[PDB]
Amino acid sequence: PVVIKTEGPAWTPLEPKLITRLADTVRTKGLRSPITMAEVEALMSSPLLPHDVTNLMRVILGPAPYALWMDAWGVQLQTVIAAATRDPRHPANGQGRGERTNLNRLKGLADGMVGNPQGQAALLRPGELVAITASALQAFREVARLA
Ligand SMILES: [Mg+2]
C-alpha cells in the first residue's frame, strides 16, 4: 500500500501476519470460501502496488493457481488499458498529455519501477493503483471461479 509522507508517496508493506493468515485461510477453507473471499477483499481494500499484489498472490496461492492468477491479471490489466486508451479522461490516466497509462506501468515494469516498491509508490498515480488493485482482485475471483 501507499501512504503520503512528508517528502511524498511512500511504500508501506502489507502486514506479514495478515498475509500468512490469509495463506492459511486459503489452504484451510479453500478459494471458493466466503471466508477467504471476504479476507482477500479486506486485504485489498487499500490500493496496492504491483509489488504488493504479485507477492500477496504468490504467497497465498499455490504454484498453479498463481500461474492462473497471473494470466487472469494480465487480461484484466489489458481491459483497463483498452479503456484508458479509448477515454483520455479515464482515471488511470494522468491529466497531462504524456500521462496515459500503459501495461508496463500497471505491472510495475516501467523505468524506475522494476522490483522496486518504493519507486512504484513514487511513480504510479492513485488511479493506476485503483486499477491495479481492482484488476488483481478480479483476477483472484476468476481463479476462484475456475478452482
Ligand atoms: Mg502464464
Q: State which residues form the domain around 140.
A: 1-147
| CATH code of 53's domain | 1.10.375.10
What spacing in Å lies between the alpha carbon of 68 and ligand 1's midpoint?
Answer: 7
Q: How many domains does the chain have?
A: 1
Nearest to 25 by CA among 6, 41, 39: 39
Quick one: cell of 7?
Answer: 517528502
Cα–Cα distance, 51 to 120 (Å, whole number): 8
Provide the b/e sequence for 71-97 (b: ≥16 CB within 10 Å): ebbeebbeebbeebeeeeebebbeeee
Cα–Cα distance, 142 to 76 (Å, whole number): 10
Locate cell 515494469: which residue? 109
What spacing in Å lies between the alpha carbon of 64 and ligand 1's midpoint?
Answer: 10
Q: What is the DSSP letter of 13?
A: P
Quick one: cell of 118?
Answer: 518504493
Technique used by the depositors: X-ray
Cα–Cα distance, 57 to 104 (Å, whole number): 19
What spacing in Å lies between the alpha carbon of 73 and ligand 1's midpoint?
Answer: 10
For residue 9, list its beta bridge partners. 4
Helices of type H across 7-146: 16-29, 34-43, 50-60, 63-86, 103-106, 117-123, 126-145
Record the resolution, in angstroms.
Answer: 2.0
